[PDB]
Nucleic acid binder design. Structure first.
Ligand SMILES: CC(C)N1C[C@H](C)n2c(c(O)c3c(=O)n(Cc4ccc(F)cc4)nc(N(C)S(C)(=O)=O)c32)C1=O
Ligand SMILES: CC(C)N1C[C@H](C)n2c(c(O)c3c(=O)n(Cc4ccc(F)cc4)nc(N(C)S(C)(=O)=O)c32)C1=O
Ligand SMILES: [Mg+2]
Ligand SMILES: [Mg+2]
Ligand SMILES: [Mg+2]
Ligand SMILES: [Mg+2]
Ligand SMILES: [Mg+2]
Ligand SMILES: [Mg+2]
Ligand SMILES: [N+]
Ligand SMILES: [N+]
Ligand SMILES: [Zn+2]
Ligand SMILES: [Zn+2]
Lengths: 184, 368, 368, 184
DNA sequence: TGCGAAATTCCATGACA
DNA sequence: ATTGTCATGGAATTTCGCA
DNA sequence: TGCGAAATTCCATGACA
DNA sequence: ATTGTCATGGAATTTCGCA
């Protein structure tokens, strides 16, 4: 077997609904399996159409050999399957109700949700503008298991934005009682 | 004047007036019998006025002015007096063309890393497509990897929207641009400072300076052209295709694609290179660093036999940028303050502002 | 195809397949173990389709196309198959730039007499002056003597009005022009035929061919510029002054003014040359004929190291004149019928018309 | 004394009134003394103004050292004298009622009047268009006294329009009875 | 039959839309 | 069936003035 | 240890408003 | 305060395949 590489497998998934930001409601999450690099795209819906529109952007930069997802309707449509076939991408689905990634990806997806949650309190509506800096954080975050950040693993160089401030990522007692009010 | 010419008539010797010729009076005018024929020697106090009348007929240069004067006159060292006036004719100085070439171009070091330097520029107006008219082109200096963004206008706000999407991937140290309105606005400066990006500007009207992105523009338009042959010019939908196509195209001199220089491995695109399949990612990023430092670098070509080089305190003139019909092509003479490098200078401009300027947009003022 | 590749697998020898390498089957595909690594040998009947896919990614030339193919494949003489396709890609052929320079310019013999050949052209639109917008410029080929006429439009009727005034002085054998509407109208042709004047036209969009008058345009605009510095651009009243000024200006290489070449004696203008004051008019016209035949004549410069020369039956392509945005810069390939001289040709154009054309507006179609 | 040259002396004079041609009525006649070369300019009046306007054209081609004329009001005005002085032209007048040129000029001026008269009968109104061909005729007409035409003497070459048909220049019995009708 | 300096000639540069 | 040109001002070369 | 031909490298040309 | 670039396809050079 050959060693794992960037672009070998992209893990994709949706997060939402969220509070409207510039009329966007969802975030399409793409994580490279090998490097742990994350790309985010804001959508208006978790549809095949919005997935195609978004991945059209990403795949004009790099094309994965395999995309993996759960059995979201968006991903199991034959429109999405035509799209992947045109591009020579193999689609891979996890069995229903049992999502499988890798340790690395699972952890990354955890961070993303946790990071998003943290910053959308206090400003549940300003997230669209924040996506760029979320990505930079995620991608310049040190990997415990490997010695390197996704940036380093993708590009083979240090980054010009090192995020030395590995944050709390947890909710302060302010933010806790603030997120129980937006719901109530 | 009349002093000199009196001594001369009575056979005395004056310096500059060769003694072997016979100087005489006739019609109340000092004449000499020269191999070309008999010419009038005007008094020194008359000579500037003669040169000027001669010159003004057609605003002629050295030889053509001299030839007119020589029809009627002789005196010692005429061309010296000719040149004296040419150096003082504002009109000649600011209208005439240069006849000295610039020194040979510099070939700046390729930025060492991806993301060290971005070169950016607009292309357009193109024919409308989906109501878009322009393209923002972003070229990473080290790799040549390129990002394309369609815009409705070459504006700061469109540039900002675009770079926010790009900078999601990485932040560059420096962005280099020409001095288009979009890039020189203070809104753009804030945006850059906010992110710790340094803005670096080309000398004005010298797109060679942005040569990395300019050269890529050509390729972009070329590919778009080929793709659109026999179809209407609907380019908006093609930008992504062009981006990917170009970033994955080999430069025969380097033997690498921009994508390869950026990532060290081909993604899943046609004819993907498989040579590092057995290396680990770590061994792969190792060979990559090695590739990156050993890329061919061109060197400065030979000077032309008539190039000129800028010297501190020299009078030089800046080329007028968008000269109106029948208006001079050159600004008034100005002074070289500092020589930043053999091809770039700072000049004080008679107003007098400091201007950083390409030597290609200068000429050395003639006749000192 | 499958025939060749079967023989090859059982260790037989096929021409073009070096025997020193071990060829094998794997995944249902013939492979060879090459110093660069293991590559697939596609069947001959597959190869054209591979080259095309490779090429189409970005419409790349020889080396960049080859490098893609070489990632996955090997077969004998790949570049031959690469080049084969490049020669068949309509899009590449009509979009790409040439990389061969024209042969060195011709320096045609100076017309022998005043009035043998006129070169004519329009300058403009200039800023309005007295409601005039253009200038008809007429340059006598032998002398460089020049006539200037302000017109409201670069029209046949204005040209006709102007030349009627000029031709009062003398009738020229030939008038040479570019192919501007004013000169190619049949009204103009009648007017010329009426007077026994032969019309001679430049190859299209190649103003070098009208170089005598073009070069004079420059001088005209230059002088006008100098005269108008700091004033509004009221040039109409200046045309006469410019005319006279230029016609009486020395060409330092010739040592004569256009007026002198035309008349053999200066009229009453400033610094008039007095050298022939003692000759009779007859002795003067004698020295003049002598001057006229002994004027310096430049010779054709050295060829560039990568110039190309036209050959009968060769595929060449004409440059598109006013190419629209994102449209090819070259017309479809066409055939050289006759080689009028090393710098001019007649081509049959696929429509197919005969077109007389400058080599500067051609490129030799690549890859035959 | 130095031999006579082109541009040494221009002889100028008016001819008219004539029958309106394109709203022109007069012809300003310029003849170079030495070569016998003729330039013609149509004017609306024999004024200083029209003389200046016309000679401005000629003198943007060649400037005479001396202009000679009779004592026409047009030529004796101080406007015309300022003009000549600006251009460094000496003005020369013949004494009143006694016009003096040279044999050559006198003969040329005779030809011009005779030639004009000839062609303006039958078409007393088309002369404006005819000026160019009148000039070519006059200038390519052989000089009995010198061996050459004015063209040849001015330019030192043969002309591309040799007028081999030295005409009658006299009026036919048709043209005689036609010119007695335009008056009557 | 040779020197220093002035005169002339050489010629790359660039612009004629 | 048509085709570069030539002002310009430093540098290079030649000529001049004098011995 | 040298041949003919194929592969690679060289590099002037031109176009990025 | 900043600075040309690089795809292209014939030609030139080097390397390959074989002896
Ligand atoms: C108005 C803003 C400041 N701008 C001003 C100038 C016009 N410019 C751009 C610009 O993008 C381009 C070009 O792409 N090219 C083409 C080019 C020519 C030679 C070369 F080596 C590379 C490219 N010329 C340009 N010019 C500077 S020119 C030489 O016409 O004055 C410009 C600007 O954005
Ligand atoms: C429309 C008619 C036929 N016309 C068409 C062409 C445009 N043209 C003229 C014309 O007068 C001039 C020019 O003066 N110059 C400038 C020039 C450039 C180089 C050179 F060596 C000399 C002059 N270019 C022109 N062009 C031909 S270009 C090269 O722009 O296509 C033309 C026409 O009258
Ligand atoms: Mg999901
Ligand atoms: Mg720009
Ligand atoms: Mg540009
Ligand atoms: Mg023209
Ligand atoms: Mg022209
Ligand atoms: Mg009278
Ligand atoms: N550098
Ligand atoms: N010729
Ligand atoms: Zn001047
Ligand atoms: Zn192609």
């Amino acid at each position: 077997d050959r060693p794992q590489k960037p672009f070998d497998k992209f893990f994709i998934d949706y997060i939402g609904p969220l509070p409207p930001s510039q009329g966007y409601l969802y975030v399409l999450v793409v994580v490279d399996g090998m490097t742990g690099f994350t790309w985010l795209y804001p959508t208006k819906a978790p549809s095949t159409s919005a997935t195609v529109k978004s991945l059209n952007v990403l795949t004009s930069i790099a094309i994965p050999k395999v995309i993996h997802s759960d059995q979201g309707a968006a991903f199991t449509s034959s429109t999405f399957a035509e799209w992947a076939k045109e591009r020579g991408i193999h689609l891979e689905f996890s069995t229903p109700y049992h999502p499988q990634s890798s340790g690395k990806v699972e952890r990354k997806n955890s961070d993303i949700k946790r990071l998003l949650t943290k910053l959308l309190v206090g400003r549940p509506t300003k997230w669209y503008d924040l996506l760029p800096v979320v990505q930079l954080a995620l991608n310049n975050t040190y990997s415990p298991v490997l010695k390197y950040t996704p940036h380093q693993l993708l590009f083979g160089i240090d980054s010009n934005t090192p995020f030395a401030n590995q944050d709390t990522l947890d909710l302060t007692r302010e933010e806790e009682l603030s997120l129980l009010q937006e719901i109530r | 004047l009349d002093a000199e010419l009196d001594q001369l008539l009575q056979g005395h010797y004056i310096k500059g007036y060769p003694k072997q010729y016979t100087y005489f009076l006739e019609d109340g005018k000092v004449k000499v019998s020269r191999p070309e024929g008999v010419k009038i020697i005007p008094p020194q106090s008359d000579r500037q006025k003669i040169v000027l009348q001669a010159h003004n007929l057609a605003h002629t240069g050295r030889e053509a002015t001299l030839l007119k004067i020589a029809n009627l006159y002789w005196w010692p060292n005429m061309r010296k007096d000719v040149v004296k006036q040419l150096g003082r004719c504002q009109q000649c100085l600011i209208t005439n063309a240069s006849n000295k070439a610039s020194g040979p171009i510099l070939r700046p070091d390729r930025p060492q890393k991806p993301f060290d330097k971005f070169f950016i520029d607009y292309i357009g107006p193109l024919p409308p497509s989906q109501g878009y008219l322009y393209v923002l082109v972003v070229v990473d200096g080290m790799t040549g990897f390129t990002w394309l963004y369609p815009t409705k206008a070459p504006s700061t706000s469109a540039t900002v929207k675009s770079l926010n999407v790009l900078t999601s991937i990485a932040i560059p140290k420096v962005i280099h641009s020409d001095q288009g309105a979009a890039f020189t606005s203070s809104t753009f400066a804030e945006w850059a400072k906010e992110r710790g990006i340094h803005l670096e500007f080309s000398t004005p009207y010298h797109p060679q300076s942005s040569g990395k992105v300019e050269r890529k523009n050509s390729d972009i338009k070329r590919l778009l052209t080929k793709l659109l042959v026999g179809r209407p010019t609907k380019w908006y939908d093609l930008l992504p295709v062009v981006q990917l196509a170009l970033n994955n195209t080999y430069s025969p001199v380097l033997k690498y694609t921009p994508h390869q220089l950026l990532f060290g491995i081909d993604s899943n695109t046609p004819f993907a290179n498989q040579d590092t399949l057995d290396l680990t990612r770590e061994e792969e990023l190792s060979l990559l660093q090695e590739i990156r430092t050993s890329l061919y670098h061109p060197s400065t070509p030979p000077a032309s036999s008539r190039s000129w080089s800028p010297v501190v305190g020299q009078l030089v003139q800046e080329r007028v940028a968008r000269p109106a019909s029948l208006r001079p092509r050159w600004h008034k003479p100005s002074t070289v303050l500092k020589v930043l490098n053999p091809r770039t200078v700072v000049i004080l401009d008679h107003l007098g502002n400091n201007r950083t300027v390409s030597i290609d947009n200068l000429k050395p003022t003639s006749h000192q």
